[PDB]
């Protein structure tokens, strides 16, 4: 592809400046935009003691060994379901 | 503006090989000597800051066996192996 | 290659001596703790 | 007096710091997973740090400072960059093979499917699409540094650089939010096992690019590149080059296509 | 003659098969005698006698084809020390069977071995080539 | 019946999805029948096939999970 | 700058070759006497 | 800023016999000194903890 | 100065020197280690206690032996000193980095050492496979200790090659082609570029074996949905370029030890050497399963790695035969180099055809697993990578020390060490072939007999090793200094004489280009 | 002038190979070594049920 | 090119008057790297050459090689001998075997 | 006078004319080999199995008492 | 099994095992025959003191020493090939039998009709019976009927092991997770023994494997018996 613009002439500064503000950036806050939209709570489905998941070989070296490192009450049961 | 050149800033080994450069000289060996045709009367000028310096010669062209050997500063001494005639010019930088 | 004579020659009886000594170093230290397997195997 | 131009070193001590770092960082790792103490590897990360510090601080004096830094030297460090960087392809291609076997072939306790029964993936479309066009806009504000910095531009080479940081700091920020959000863990089998090893090495070199672009935004700051010799800056260009390529392909793979 | 470690970078003298005129004459200052033999070796060669001839010989080279190519009593060290370490290796093997090496396994004791090899051959352990092939069943004797 | 036959579509050294989909079939089959009221019986060959190549703690694991709730592939 | 030459390009030094026995000794030695010593701590640990 | 690169040029280039990682001056003799104390107290510290997990607790 | 010299050397002829030494250590320790081995099946019945301390030995024996003993002496010994040298470069592309990749080594061996003395050590083979290898059946810090290990030394390497590769691209007189290098320079490039591209993938599995271990992943647990098997390709994917690693800057040093003493200015075929070095490196990335024969694989895919396997016997031929031809007409000198060198033409034919009978994987079936590739593997390593070590260290001392060995002894420690390794591996075929399984610290009696002689050959190859350390110090207490040697015209690393200086090429060579 | 192999060599080689030959037909044969070598030809099978 | 163009180079080689001591070490040097042995009349024009250089030894050490390069066919070198006999005679050049240069 | 002999590619006719041996000796014990070894044991199968009664062998085993099963 | 002194495999119980005994000697014979040459040419190359020490050429010879491999990897891989296809042609199976390694024991599983399964140990040396085999015998066989196709099936449930019987020319790996297949059958009666192939622990060395081949109707009768 070409995608849909022109230029060529040269690419100096001015042209990958032209693309930062022009292209680049805008997609960023356009996803942004669409992010900040679909963002907020979506629901915690039941928990299931499934045995390939929620696995335990070996506790965890921190906290009281059954927490994972980014645990969230919110949406990470532990091995026995969510937490208090 | 406002990003240094070159020409401004680059310093010690780096500037003196620039500088040199733009001389159109080669004090650091960056760049392949041509042959003479490495006669007796013609024979191919080695550079040194010393009274020896190591030659590799390259008898033909492809050979992928190197010729090696200690050139001293006096007459002229031949490859070993095809008899090309090199000198030593000694001394300076 | 040539090379010359010994500076520090090292005659037969000395090879001998450094012979010995390197062969004890290995055989030693390791026949003591075979010799004594046993001791550990049980204790 | 040499006639060549490459570069002696002066004897240094960090090669041996550098390698008892590894030994206190490696040992403190295994005291902290089995004997439940964090000193040793506390250490080892601290003598790592100032190893790196000093070591590439040793190699601004050598080049912006002295001038051992010629042509031959330069071209040298550009082979050892490349080379570098296709090892780290290499590492990152052992997790994508891991990712793509379970995948492939999701075994009776997944459920024999992909996404393992009871995994529900993040959506591609939300804030994974939102990091990829961050690290791509990344690529095209670092690109303009760049040309800024050859056409002699200081000002533009200091905002587009500062921009392109900005970017990798918000695409970690994203990426430490979305794990803290994330409904499945690590520990949930081969699913969180891949997701998380594979792109949580993606963001430790993140965090590592982010770092020599800020290295880079320092010394730009302090004059040390010329329109013409700023390796430190190709190198650190290249290297980021290489972290959203491998996002892409983690996006494709992981994200997308695995879900 | 006296050849010199800070000589390396030089031209140096050596006696090959394959490379018979070396770079450098073996002897290179000469005494009045050795002078005067110099200048006669411009003249006539049927002049020089047979001692001039060898002495000339000697200050070009040092040893000639017949030295330098001899064979040598060396091989007989070699071989006869290599045997000497090879047995000085069973003092260490018989040392081990003494103070390491238990009591084997009862199941090598000599009837043991009787009963085992007629349960193999009942159950007609490699009956086509390996083992009970070489049983003879009718006789009930090994096969000749 | 004697074995489990060649089947086709697991022709290969590695026979774990053919112990799982037959696993499969004959509980999906016990639930239709069981479900639209008849005969759980027709669900027979797979059982049989199952029990042939499944091993024991394998079936037993998994009737263990299909108790429980927790057992991982749709039927 | 360092020494140069035969006998000084090395960590160890040969001026005396009884010297440099006892320290190779000592060397070559310790490697080899170590697994001995690493079965010999693990048979006496259970 | 100003650009003192040629002051910085001027300090690392001074003849004065220093290897590199102690051209700066002073600091340099400190950071190098607390690296190395902490690498070799640490290596130290490793082998105490190796003596203490080689034995049953 | 010591301190400055030694611990913080940016000189590429010092930190070859400590590679050597530090190799030489690691070689007692696996020797050591493998005496231990045949002591215990010397006789039947058991000596050192179950399977566990055993293969605990076994384990750390291939470690060592590959990792602290092959890998330093040939590549950062024999490369760090010869590479720059016969280049005429006046050190490697990265000084400092290379002091780093030495000093990583002790380190990585301490970690070694750490994993066999706390709990039982980790006997799990070589090759770590879980779930033997995981945190049920081998609970605690000794496997973590290997796989620590295993990455510095992983570290150490790929920093290394990157060095290697650079060095030899970038640091070569204007003039000098990469088809004006000499062999032994290929084979280190060669062997650099396989490093570069293999040890990231083992990085990689062992670091899953290690989050399996610690961190509740499950890549290679069928309980969360992994697969052992992933761990043993990711693993081999490594293991075979591994082997050619292992092998290469040998056939570069044998090369230039044949060539050097047949009085021949140049090795026969030169560009044929080249492409069977780039040959067999590229073909060793394409075979790793036939490490996998029995796991239970298709057909189809173990006929293709049957296939792929043997086509590695055309390059490698070319070079057997371009070394016979170098040998044919030459000045032969039966220096104790030589032999060596005679000694791995041969031997490492007969362990490359054992490996062949082996790429066959319906036989392989058989003899997987068994004392067949134990015996292949050990004509190739301690036949092949061992005595082109053995070559080059006699051929090379009196350049690297400026004193010559005592030719004879040189020649008794060679006929020693070849009939002991001859008569512990040889007799390990039958053993094979019969079906005697590896890792096992007893056998059935029927298998007595040629495990009875296998030991025996082993204390003979002990015999000779200490025998070597003798010779060294008989070189070094006598101090017969060198002053001419032959062939410098094309030998260019002598050219600076016995020892070279610290610095050399400090004025670069002359080469025109015509 | 004769060398040592010359002076020694014959006597280095003789009493080598006696030495060898020697300590490794004792030790074959005199201290307990278990070689199991093939009951074919050896060995009178015995009941064992 | 024929044996003959090849022996034809060889003699005009050492029959150059004024060859000097380098151009005759070079050409034996180069020439005994071949699988043959020099005709005579190649060797007779390298020996006229060492006269002409004022070296007997070098002329001995020649007819030394000749011997050395047929290994073990001991009927090339008396052959050699016999036909270089006149050169021999002509220069007063003696043989390695009559100045006993033949014991080891 | 002695007749002239050849004095030209002595290493290479001695070459020749052994590598021309190696591969005649190497023909001569692939034959050998191919039925002393290879057709030897191909003979030995056959003969075993052509008249092999599988029935008897196992009664056979059966008295001598080797089973678990069949006593 | 293996026998004291014994230099090759053990004698064939299986037409596929005889397959690979000839495929080995003809391997085997181009093996001997080309380290004996090498061997050969390097003693060959080294008894002359005849000399050719100048630049040689290369590209000819470089054909044959190519091509001549080449065509001996050909004769070696056809072969090959023809017996890895025929291992893996469908056979029909009369019976399937389970096998599930363990740390350190077989347990075998014959399901296809009731339940039965047991555990396979080895006989610990101080108990063997007189005439029995050191490290080989078990409590409890694998009896099978011989003369008929049956398909082995094999897993483990802890760590690696891997199921080996030489005579037969069988080795399956026993992994978690995975059921290997692989077909058996035996020319004759007898007993057949392995061990276990895939290093596993402790005792590793001490989990042998025991085929006992019968006839059909004592295999029936032994299997009612054991349920
Ligand atoms: C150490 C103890 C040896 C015990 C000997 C056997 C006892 C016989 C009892 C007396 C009773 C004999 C009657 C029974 C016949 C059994 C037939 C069979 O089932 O057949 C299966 C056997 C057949 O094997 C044999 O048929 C014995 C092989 C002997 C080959 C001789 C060459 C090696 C040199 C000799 C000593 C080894 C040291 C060098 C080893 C290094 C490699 C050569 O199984 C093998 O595969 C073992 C070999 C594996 C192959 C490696 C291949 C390449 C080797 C080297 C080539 C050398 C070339 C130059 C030839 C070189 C000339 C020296
Ligand atoms: C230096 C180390 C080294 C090298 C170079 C090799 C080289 C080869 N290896 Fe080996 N190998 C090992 C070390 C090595 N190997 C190790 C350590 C293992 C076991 C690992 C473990 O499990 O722990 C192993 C295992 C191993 C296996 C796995 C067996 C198993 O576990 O069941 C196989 C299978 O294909 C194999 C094949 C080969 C082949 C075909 C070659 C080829 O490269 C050989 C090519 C050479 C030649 C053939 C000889 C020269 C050629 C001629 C004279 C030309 C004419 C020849 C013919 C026409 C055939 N090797
Ligand atoms: C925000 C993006 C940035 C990520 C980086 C930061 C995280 C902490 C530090 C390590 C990062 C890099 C190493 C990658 C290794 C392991 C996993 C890290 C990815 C991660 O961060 O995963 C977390 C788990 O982390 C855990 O266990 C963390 C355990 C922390 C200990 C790390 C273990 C380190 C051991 C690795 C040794 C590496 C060997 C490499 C050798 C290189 C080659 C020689 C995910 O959290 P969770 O709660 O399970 O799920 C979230 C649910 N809400
Ligand atoms: C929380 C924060 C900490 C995070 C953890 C650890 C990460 C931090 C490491 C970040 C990397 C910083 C690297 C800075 C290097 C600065 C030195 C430099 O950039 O040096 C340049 C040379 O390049 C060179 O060596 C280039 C050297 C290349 C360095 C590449 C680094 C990647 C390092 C990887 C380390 C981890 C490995 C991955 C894990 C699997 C100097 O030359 P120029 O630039 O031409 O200047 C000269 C001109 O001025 C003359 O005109
Ligand atoms: C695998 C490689 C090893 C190969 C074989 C080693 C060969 C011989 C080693 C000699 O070793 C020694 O010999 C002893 C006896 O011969 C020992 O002394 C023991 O024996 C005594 C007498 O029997 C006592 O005097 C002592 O206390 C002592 O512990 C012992 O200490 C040891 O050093
Ligand atoms: Cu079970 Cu090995
Ligand atoms: O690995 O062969
Ligand atoms: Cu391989
Ligand atoms: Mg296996
Ligand atoms: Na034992
Ligand atoms: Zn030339």
Sequence with gaps: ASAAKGDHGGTGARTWRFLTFGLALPSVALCTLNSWLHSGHRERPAFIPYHHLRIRTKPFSWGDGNHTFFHNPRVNPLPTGYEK | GGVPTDEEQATGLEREVMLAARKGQDPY???????????????????????????????????????????HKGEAQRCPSCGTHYKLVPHQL | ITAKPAKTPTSPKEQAIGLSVTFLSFLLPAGWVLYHLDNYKKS | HQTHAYHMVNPSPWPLTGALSALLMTSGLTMWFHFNSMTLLMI??????????????????????????????????????????????????????????????????????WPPTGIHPLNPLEVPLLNTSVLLASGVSITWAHHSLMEGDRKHMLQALFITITLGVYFTLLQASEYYEAPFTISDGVYGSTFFVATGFHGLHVIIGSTFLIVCFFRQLKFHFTSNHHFGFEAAAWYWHFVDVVWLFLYVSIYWWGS | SVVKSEDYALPSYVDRRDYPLPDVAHVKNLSASQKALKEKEKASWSSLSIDEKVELYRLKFKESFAEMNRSTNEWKTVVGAAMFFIGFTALLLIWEKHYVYGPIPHTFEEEWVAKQTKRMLDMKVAPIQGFSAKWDYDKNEWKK | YQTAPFDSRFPNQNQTRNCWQNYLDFHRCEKAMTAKGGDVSVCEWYRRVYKSLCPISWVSTWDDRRAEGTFPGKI | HYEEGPGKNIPFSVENKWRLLAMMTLFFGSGFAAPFFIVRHQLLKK | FENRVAEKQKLFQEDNGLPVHLKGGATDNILYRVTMTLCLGGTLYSLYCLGWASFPH | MFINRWLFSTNHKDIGTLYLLFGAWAGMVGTALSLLIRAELGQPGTLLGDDQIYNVVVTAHAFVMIFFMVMPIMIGGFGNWLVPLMIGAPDMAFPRMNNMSFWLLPPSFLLLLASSMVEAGAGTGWTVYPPLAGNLAHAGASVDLTIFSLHLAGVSSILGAINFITTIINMKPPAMSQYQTPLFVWSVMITAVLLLLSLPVLAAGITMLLTDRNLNTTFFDPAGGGDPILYQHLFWFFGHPE??????????????????????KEPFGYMGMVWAMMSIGFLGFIVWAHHMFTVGMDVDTRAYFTSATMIIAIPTGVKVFSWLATLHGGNIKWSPAMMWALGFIFLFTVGGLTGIVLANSSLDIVLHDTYYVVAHFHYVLSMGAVFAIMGGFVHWF????????????????????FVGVNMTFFPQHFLGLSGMPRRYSDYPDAYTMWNTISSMGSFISLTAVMLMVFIIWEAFASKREVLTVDLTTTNLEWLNGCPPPYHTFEEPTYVNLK | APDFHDKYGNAVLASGATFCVAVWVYMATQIGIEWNPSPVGRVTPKEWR | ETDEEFDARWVTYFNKPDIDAWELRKGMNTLVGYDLVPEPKIIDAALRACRRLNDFASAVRIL????????????????????????????????????????? | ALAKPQMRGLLARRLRFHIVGAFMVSLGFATFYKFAVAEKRKKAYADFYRNYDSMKDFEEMRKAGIFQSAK | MAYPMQLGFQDATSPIMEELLHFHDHTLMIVFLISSLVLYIISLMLTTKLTHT??????????????????????????????????????????????????????????????????????????????????????????????????????????????????????????????????????????????????????????????????????????????
């Design chain 4, 44 to 113: 080892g990360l601290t003598t790592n740090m100032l190893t790196m510090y000093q070591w590439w601080r040793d190699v601004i004096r050598e080049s912006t400072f002295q001038g051992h830094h010629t042509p031959a030297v330069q071209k040298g460090l550009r082979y050892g960059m490349i080379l570098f960087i296709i090892s780290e392809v290499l590492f990152f291609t052992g997790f994508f093979w891991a990712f793509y076997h379970s995948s492939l072939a999701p075994t009776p306790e997944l459920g024999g499917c």
């Design chain 13, 54 to 227: 100048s630049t040689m050429d290369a590209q000819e010879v470089e054909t044959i020493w190519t091509i001549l491999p080449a065509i001996i990897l050909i004769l070696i891989a056809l072969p090959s090939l023809r017996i890895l296809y025929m291992m893996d042609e469908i056979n029909n199976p009369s019976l399937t039998v389970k096998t599930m390694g363990h740390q350190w024991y077989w347990s075998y599983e014959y399901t296809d009709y009731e339940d039965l399964s047991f555990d396979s140990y080895m006989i610990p040396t101080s108990e063997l019976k007189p005439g029995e085999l050191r490290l080989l015998e078990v409590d409890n066989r694998v009896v099978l009927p011989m003369e008929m196709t049956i398909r082995m099936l094999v897993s483990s449930e802890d760590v690696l092991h891997s199921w080996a019987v030489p005579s037969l020319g069988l080795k399956t790996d026993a992994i978690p997770g995975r059921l290997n297949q692989t077909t058996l059958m035996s020319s004759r009666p007898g007993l057949y023994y392995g061990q276990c192939s895939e290093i596993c622990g402790s005792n590793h060395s001490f989990m042998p494997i025991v085929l006992e081949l019968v006839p059909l109707k004592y295999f029936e009768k032994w299997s009612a018996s054991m349920l």
């Design chain 9, 243 to 264: 082997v050619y690693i292992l092998i290469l800057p040998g056939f570069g040093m044998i090369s230039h030890i044949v060539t050097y003493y047949s009085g021949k």
């Design chain 9, 398 to 417: 009196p350049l690297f020390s400026g004193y010559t060995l005592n030719d004879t002894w040189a020649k008794i420690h060679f006929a020693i060490m």
């Design chain 11, 64 to 104: 030394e090689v000749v011997k050395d390069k047929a290994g073990p066919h001991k009927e090339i070198y008396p052959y050699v001998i016999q036909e270089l006999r006149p050169t021999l005679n002509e220069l007063g050049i003696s043989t390695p075997e009559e100045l006993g240069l033949d014991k080891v």
């Design chain 2, 29 to 71: 060996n960056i760049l392949a000597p041509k042959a003479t045709s490495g006669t007796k009367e013609d024979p191919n000028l080695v550079p040194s800051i010393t009274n020896k310096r190591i030659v590799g010669c390259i008898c033909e062209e492809d050979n992928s066996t190197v010729i090696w050997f200690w050139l």
